[PDB]
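Q: Structure for this?
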Amino acid sequence: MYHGALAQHLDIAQLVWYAQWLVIWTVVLLYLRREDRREGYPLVEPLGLVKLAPEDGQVYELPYPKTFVLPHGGTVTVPRRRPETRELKLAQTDGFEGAPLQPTGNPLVDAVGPASYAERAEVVDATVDGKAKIVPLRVATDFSIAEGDVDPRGLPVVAADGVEAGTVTDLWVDRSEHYFRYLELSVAGSARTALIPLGFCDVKKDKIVVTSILSEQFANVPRLQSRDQITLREEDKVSAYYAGGLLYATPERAESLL
Amino acid sequence: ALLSFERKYRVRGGTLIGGDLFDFWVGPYFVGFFGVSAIFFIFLGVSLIGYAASQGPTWDPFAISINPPDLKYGLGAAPLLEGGFWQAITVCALGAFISWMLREVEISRKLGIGWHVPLAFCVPIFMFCVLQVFRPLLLGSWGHAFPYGILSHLDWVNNFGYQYLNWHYNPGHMSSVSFLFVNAMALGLHGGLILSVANPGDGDKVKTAEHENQYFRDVVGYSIGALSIHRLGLFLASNIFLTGAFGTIASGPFWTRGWPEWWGWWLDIPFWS
Amino acid sequence: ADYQTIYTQIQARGPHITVSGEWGDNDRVGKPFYSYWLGKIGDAQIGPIYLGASGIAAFAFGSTAILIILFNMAAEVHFDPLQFFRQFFWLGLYPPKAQYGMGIPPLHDGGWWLMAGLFMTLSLGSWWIRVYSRARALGLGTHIAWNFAAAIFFVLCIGCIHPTLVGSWSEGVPFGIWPHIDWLTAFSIRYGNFYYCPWHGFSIGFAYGCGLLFAAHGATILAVARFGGDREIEQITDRGTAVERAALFWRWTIGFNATIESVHRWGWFFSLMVMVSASVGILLTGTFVDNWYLWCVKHGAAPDYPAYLPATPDPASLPGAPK
Amino acid sequence: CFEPPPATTTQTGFRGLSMGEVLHPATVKAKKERDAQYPPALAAVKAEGPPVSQVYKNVKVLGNLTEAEFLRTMTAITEWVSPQEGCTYCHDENNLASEAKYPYVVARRMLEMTRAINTNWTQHVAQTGVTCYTCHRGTPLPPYVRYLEPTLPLNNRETPTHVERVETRSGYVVRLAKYTAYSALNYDPFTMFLANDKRQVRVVPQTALPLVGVSRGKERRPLSDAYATFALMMSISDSLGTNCTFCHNAQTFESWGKKSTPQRAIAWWGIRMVRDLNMNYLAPLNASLPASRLGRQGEAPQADCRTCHQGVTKPLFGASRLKDYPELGPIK
Ligand code: BCB
Ligand code: BCB
Ligand code: BCB
Ligand SMILES: C/C=C1/c2cc3[nH]c4c(c3C)C(=O)[C@H](C(=O)OC)c4c3nc(cc4[nH]c(cc(n2)[C@@H]1C)c(C(C)=O)c4C)[C@@H](C)[C@@H]3CCC(=O)OC/C=C(/C)CCC[C@H](C)CCC[C@H](C)CCCC(C)C
Ligand SMILES: C/C=C1/c2cc3[nH]c4c(c3C)C(=O)[C@H](C(=O)OC)c4c3nc(cc4[nH]c(cc(n2)[C@@H]1C)c(C(C)=O)c4C)[C@@H](C)[C@@H]3CCC(=O)OC/C=C(\C)CCC[C@H](C)CCC[C@H](C)CCCC(C)C
Ligand SMILES: CC(C)=CCC/C(C)=C/CC/C(C)=C/CC/C(C)=C/CC/C(C)=C/CC/C(C)=C/CC/C(C)=C/CC1=C(C)C(=O)c2ccccc2C1=O
Ligand code: HEC
Ligand code: HEC
Ligand code: HEC
Ligand code: HEC
Ligand SMILES: CC(C)=CCC/C(C)=C/C=C/C(C)=C/C=C/C(C)=C/C=C\C=C(C)\C=C\C=C(/C)CC/C=C(/C)CCCC(C)C
Ligand SMILES: CCCCCCCCCCCC[N+](C)(C)[O-]
Ligand SMILES: CCCCCCCCCCCC[N+](C)(C)[O-]
Ligand SMILES: CCCCCCCCCCCC[N+](C)(C)[O-]
Ligand SMILES: [Fe+2]
């Protein structure tokens, strides 16, 4: 006789094989793939007009809503009603359903394609104990630059066309993570300030190189509401601006590299 | 068709070849020139697999195996039934993988994001080349490469290991395994952490970056931080193969004995012999 | 290129944040110090460290375990300190070689092994309590502790649950660098080739998948570091363009996508499933399957191959062949 | 650290299974040159006069031979076993029938042993056969022999270090490792498997599911047996200068048929032959040898796979003198 044998060519390990697969697909399909739909759903079509009752699949694919209790008051519930309100300055290059859209205006200011920003809260991201998290060093006076590294305050910012476009006046620090996230700079010949995320900055000893945009394009970098703090949406707006540059700053960057 | 937030990003441009000609979507999938080459190569490979499989004994997906040639054919073409199908299929796979990678580049440019993903995906393409191309070149036959079958490929890994007596003692393997294990641990820790912060449960409030770092400082005296665990993650994962490659390429061309014996360099220093 | 994804160009220093836990805030010891080279690829702050009961219990029990192992190792080189350094990798503490069944083996033949086992097990349990309790103290989920519980469960499976189920301590994992490795081949040989154990395959599938996911996830976050994708908690509660682009990268590549939260669920689950799958395999091994290859053959799964050199009858079954 | 390319490879299984030999040309060339030292066969002599059983006084084994044939045998024996020592290693200068020297009696038994190998163990040694040279390689003490405990070096022509010496206890783990191809496997496969026939090498069940009656508690073989078998197999692999896939498809180590090579069957007979040789010919020689030859438990040196093979899959690359010296077997 055999340990693990059952009637007529079944054995325990064979059943467990079937069970294991069932468990996997259950978790994958009924749990995980529904969790994946907490953002961006329900989907949008060339006008899903059926305004009186919902299509069945759209209900089945979603999970039951969950509510995050935010740390500084408020709640967010996902998934939810979140349509894109703002007018997008884009035109359909063809009638085909999955044809690309062309920008109609100036895509950096108009904020489309890679220059797009999410409609995040017009709210200042906060530290564990309520203070504004992302602030420049003139405010965060207990933060310093570390012994060894470039202090960029004073150094010029050279844009993609080799033209000095401004002077770095301050660094904005993340007080929650001890991490510099933007440089503030004076745009030469414009009497204004502008943030640039450190990711678009090549920090040298004698200058800061920025290949994302041209010198002239520092003019229209999104302005902040306040001098000494920034909102989650403003961060998106600002970051997006430079990223737009990568595809749009000159005509030839959208075209094929080869 | 479209996610609620998708339409604004779906713009023309960022291709590497062909400009507007292949710059479109089909359902959710971006196409591009490299979507077209990918599908070409997939179709060809899957056809060649189907044809080759029918000429073989069985149709059980576990027991199907398309094997490379005998060693006597060295680096030449082999008759289709006896290793040619394997040779053709290998070319179609490389066509498909490289296409898949370059397609990801195009998709990255359109979104105006980093090329880090296609970059990371070169690592497993490279490792596939180590096993099927570079190591067979150095030993002199395609017949040293691995067969395409669900279970048959394991029989190759098995015997290849035992050609060097105890493959566990291969130092490149030791490195590889250590990265495999630590990478899996770290993914659990990372995924665990994030969820632990956003989902304390019992209606208790969502926590903060500060809490993230405080947790790891408390448990193990150090926290690498938010951005850095992503860099470390990519690094640990990628080193599974980058180091493993050395252990694989060494076995045969640069070492013909058993792998435990290699540790003679240490054990047999005269100073303590 | 974004150089910030490679290393921090300008490090920042500032006052040390301490998040207050519901208990044990005084049991944090050490004074923080900052490392400049570490801070290039990480957070510069090393220390302080929390030092509770469960942590102290863990160090206590673990050190006992380590001492039992090292003493036995040294005994294996008749205490010669030079040969100890030379032969370290080859030294180990073995389970019983003789079959005593579940009998408590003599100290010279795996009693010490059994003792080291107990003390390591206690050390893991104590550390588990630390990992769990620290999460409760800071008002966090127990997600990490459950992943870790699976890791510990797997260790108990190879070390004592499987030996208990077949009823022989001889099948435990030895302590030692090469010796714990040697066990892998001995176990695989005994149970008919672990490549043919489906739970092995699942474990490997998830393990490799952890490779795939962390490479993909890590690379994804770095690729959206410019838009703040590293700040994942607030991208959950307030979706920014970082995670919008991240999701569209994948949706356009593979046809579907995740949220910034759910990808962490995927990863957590895959990590967990490496150990859960491995555990199921070991529980079935010995207990209900003796030879995994023959089991695959029984169910028509095994591949077969023509002879190359001639097939070779087992000479033991020829007529008039010796013992 | 490393060995430079290229590598000689062979195929021993179906294409795609990575089965076969992986050899470094330099190493093979060195072993080939070493083995090429096998002295050529002495010229043939015509058989004339009576049997030496009627001529000489104390001839028990080779009595069938004529005088010229017999002295050819003795000249060859000297060349193979005691080329530097000469006839006087086994004989009194003034009485060739005296048995006073221990090598004489041992040499008689060795003749009987060698003839047994070539007659009864043809399942292993085939047409090739063995002569005294196969093991001895021109010295009275063969380079590769085994005691009931592991010793270093493997070649007893090399001088041992302090740690290598058997009495030095701190070197035990290393003595053992070098017999098992550098593994940490903690088993002496010679004493376990080759010294006698008490232990079964096979450890792997021949049923998918565990048989009730053999599968729980003290009914079970301990896992140590599987470690031991592995150790034997590492040792065997190293002793022939080869790897597992010479004999096995690792898909199923336990299977014969298409999952094993003919060399595996031959290796099986080799185990049996080595056991016969140790138990019935070599081990009983502790009575006839001086204490300087014996190991620390009064054991004579005994043979393993290496004794003949010396890191080559055929001893001396298949060199044979069987036709040249009919008197060493096979015997009708
Ligand atoms: C008996 C034999 C042994 C053996 C023999 C062995 C060999 C011979 C080799 C390894 C290697 C490795 N072993 Mg290993 N091994 C490992 C772990 C590992 C891996 C970390 C490592 C790399 C595997 C690899 O190259 O994948 C390769 C993966 C590739 C190439 C992925 C390709 C992906 C491709 C680009 C995309 C494919 C796309 C699909 C076709 C698309 C279809 C998708 C659908 C959805 C549309 C562990 C954890 C253990 C344990 C626990 O004991 C172990 C034991 C053993 N190994 C045995 C001792 N091992 C490798 C190594 O690095 O050695 C140092 C290696 O060469
Ligand atoms: C040197 C190391 C090798 C190795 C050693 C190895 C071991 C030891 C084990 C596997 C296993 C597996 N290997 Mg594998 N392997 C595989 C694919 C596979 C799968 C059949 C399976 C699970 C993989 C997984 O989940 O990964 C992570 C990826 C995930 C989770 C995404 C989904 C992947 C999807 C399941 C892939 C399925 C592929 C298709 C069946 C093949 C394509 C079909 C065509 C017609 C479209 C591919 C496609 C390649 C290529 C192209 O190089 C490869 C190379 C190697 N493997 C090397 C030769 N592999 C396991 C198994 O169970 O096999 C029977 C197993 O135990
Ligand atoms: C020749 C022998 C083989 C073998 C024998 C083998 C065995 C016997 C077992 C596996 C298992 C496994 N094998 Mg595997 N194997 C694997 C991969 C794997 C793993 C994914 C899987 C799970 C083990 C694990 O992750 O532990 C890493 C994680 C561990 C060990 C958990 C540790 C957590 C712990 C809490 C840490 C605590 C440490 C403390 C801090 C320190 C305290 C210690 C001090 C006090 C002394 C690959 C990729 C390959 C390839 C490519 O060939 C392979 C080939 C082989 N394996 C050969 C077929 N393998 C396991 C399995 O899945 O079986 C079904 C298993 O039991
Ligand atoms: C797929 C799932 C994976 C997985 C998962 C998880 N694994 C976790 C968690 C999860 C979720 C935890 O939360 C926990 C942890 O805490 O992480 C930070 C942990 C663990 N995983 C460790 C080791 C490991 N995981 C392995 C494998 C897998 N894991 C599999 C692959 C392997 C392999 C591959 O063999 C190894 C060796 C330890 C670091 C730890 C236990 C310490 C202990 O039990 O105490 C034991 C007591 C001792 C005295 C030993 C001291 C030495 C060690 C190295 C500890 C030193 C730490 C010390 C604080 C340093 C001070 C210095 C400071 C001043 C600067
Ligand atoms: C350390 C590095 C890690 C790593 C990293 C990353 N991995 C990535 C990315 C990164 C970054 C992506 O960006 C990319 C992706 O999109 O993510 C969803 C991807 C992907 N990782 C896949 C498979 C995968 N990753 C593995 C391993 C690691 N990944 C390691 C761990 C393993 C194993 C075996 O471990 C597998 C099986 C696919 C799902 C996907 C490619 C799809 C493709 O290429 O489409 C195009 C090709 C096809 C759709 C089919 C092609 C059919 C050919 C022509 C005919 C078949 C031939 C074939 C050779 C026959 C084999 C038979 C078989 C039984 C032997
Ligand atoms: C028919 C035709 C002509 C079409 C033309 C167009 C064309 C080229 C189509 C291609 C068709 C093909 C070949 C489709 C096959 C697609 C493939 C390869 C699918 C493989 C999917 C698999 C198995 C993936 C394994 C990894 C896995 C388990 C992923 C699950 C979780 C996901 C989706 C992770 C991706 C993901 C990661 C990694 C994040 O970090 C992240 C961060 C923030 C938001 C979202 C994400 C996110 O989605
Ligand atoms: C040991 C390895 C030997 C060496 C070297 C030589 N001889 Fe020998 N001899 C040996 C044995 C065991 C025997 C007995 C053989 C038997 O069949 O029982 C012999 C015998 C002789 C004889 C016969 C003399 C007699 O017993 O009456 C002669 C004449 C003789 N041996 C000569 C001889 C010479 C000339 C040698 C060097 C060339 C020589 N022997 C070497 C063992 C060994
Ligand atoms: C391996 C299968 C052997 C073959 C074939 C022959 N001999 Fe041997 N011999 C062998 C061993 C393992 C030993 C023990 C070690 C030892 O030195 O005693 C021996 C021993 C001898 C001796 C004694 C030498 C001495 O101790 O000084 C002699 C004289 C001898 N062997 C002779 C001999 C002859 C003449 C052979 C062919 C007829 C022969 N041996 C074959 C192993 C093996
Ligand atoms: C031929 C010269 C061999 C080489 C090289 C290896 N093995 Fe082997 N193995 C061989 C034989 C003749 C036997 C049968 C022994 C008997 O007395 O019946 C074996 C046996 C095994 C086993 C046990 C299989 C069983 O039925 O239980 C195992 C697990 C095994 N061999 C493994 C193994 C490995 C890993 C090898 C390379 C290190 C290896 N063998 C080499 C013949 C030969
Ligand atoms: C001297 C008495 C021997 C001992 C002890 C062992 N082997 Fe041997 N082996 C010997 C000879 C003379 C030959 C013949 C060579 C030929 O041309 O046939 C062999 C052959 C083998 C083989 C076959 C190799 C091949 O076909 O390539 C194998 C696999 C083999 N021997 C293995 C083996 C093992 C495992 C031994 C210890 C158990 C062993 N042999 C001992 C002589 C002698
Ligand atoms: C009823 C009672 C009596 C019996 C039950 C007791 C019980 C529950 C026993 C359980 C035993 C278990 C689970 C045993 C498991 C053993 C295992 C899996 C051992 C695995 C690996 C061991 C290794 C790698 C040992 C290494 C040892 C050393 C390096 C020496 C020690 C020193 C160190 C510094 C450890 C470093 C380890 C590593 C991080 C480098
Ligand atoms: C990595 C090993 C995977 C082996 C897969 C073999 C599973 C066998 C179970 C098949 C299901 C049962 N049945 C009836 C079809 O035989
Ligand atoms: C062998 C390990 C098995 C791992 C299983 C993970 C597969 C992921 C499947 C993705 C399915 C996608 N989708 C949209 C069809 O649901
Ligand atoms: C039954 C075994 C299946 C193994 C896992 C296969 C992964 C499925 C991914 C293909 C689905 C692709 N799709 C529809 C999302 O685009
Ligand atoms: Fe993350």
